[PDB]
Assembly symmetry: C2
Homo-oligomer: 106 residues x 2
């Protein structure tokens, strides 16, 4: 999928997690988030189209997804273990990663 | 996929990395490893079929995959950044995670 589709998937599923009741709902949403972030990892955003794949900006951009995917994975681990509230807390904190990349590159 | 299929994917792609020449080869192999490890995360192995999903053994088993996925992810980052030799060194070291789980549960 393209960047915008992956980002909508990320956003929709974050909302699902916030209001989820059980571990199955949270696990599913984070699983979809992991796939969407992985798909987006390789993408070149509009604001960086004129930059080289090896530019400081693109290294920074890809590093943001590496951070995000690690956070999603750790949240998913908690969901796997039935730790609903704590996974929801992890999902809340990773918004900082969403925000930080948007700040620079959206 | 079942455990055996995911493990074959894990094994075959590790061999690919070992003898890879460029970053594209390593990135592709690690991407496939990530998917296979994620798919195997929820699996109940033959030796643990009589155990509860909340048993100490299944907690230990799932934790091994959490570790492996994080290691694959970190290697994949290196591969994405064109760091071939260093990604290959990362793939070498995670064999310890493969071996440790097999030691107990294979
Ligand atoms: C789970 C965390 C994140 C959420 C919930 C999120 C959400 C969104 C949303 C709702 C949009 C609006 C565009 C659309 O989807 O139609 C967007 C755009 C964008 N996001 Fe994210 N985002 C997240 C993380 C990230 C990260 C980590 C990066 C970079 C490493 C990133 C880079 C971008 C860029 C460059 C755009 C603008 C795309 C365009 O204008 O075509 N996002 N994001
Ligand atoms: C990159 C690391 C790994 C590699 C290369 C690897 C490789 C393999 C291979 C080749 C097999 C034999 C499959 C077959 O042909 O029947 C196997 C089996 C198995 N592995 Fe792994 N493995 C890895 C990681 C892990 C981890 C981390 C765990 C535990 C958390 C694990 C648990 C098992 C189990 C339970 C079996 C037996 C499956 C069955 O009998 O159905 N493996 N592995």
């Amino acid at each position: 999928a393209d960047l915008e589709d992956n980002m909508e998937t990320l956003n929709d599923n974050l909302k699902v997690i916030e209001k989820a009741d059980n571990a199955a709902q949270v696990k599913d949403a984070l699983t979809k988030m992991a796939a969407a972030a992985a798909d987006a990892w390789s993408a070149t955003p509009p604001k960086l189209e004129d930059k080289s794949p090896d530019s400081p900006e693109m290294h920074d951009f890809r590093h943001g997804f590496w951070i995000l995917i690690g956070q999603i994975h750790d949240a998913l681990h908690l969901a796997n273990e039935g730790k609903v509230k704590e996974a929801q807390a992890a999902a809340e904190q990773l918004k900082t990663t969403c925000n930080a990349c948007h700040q620079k590159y959206r």
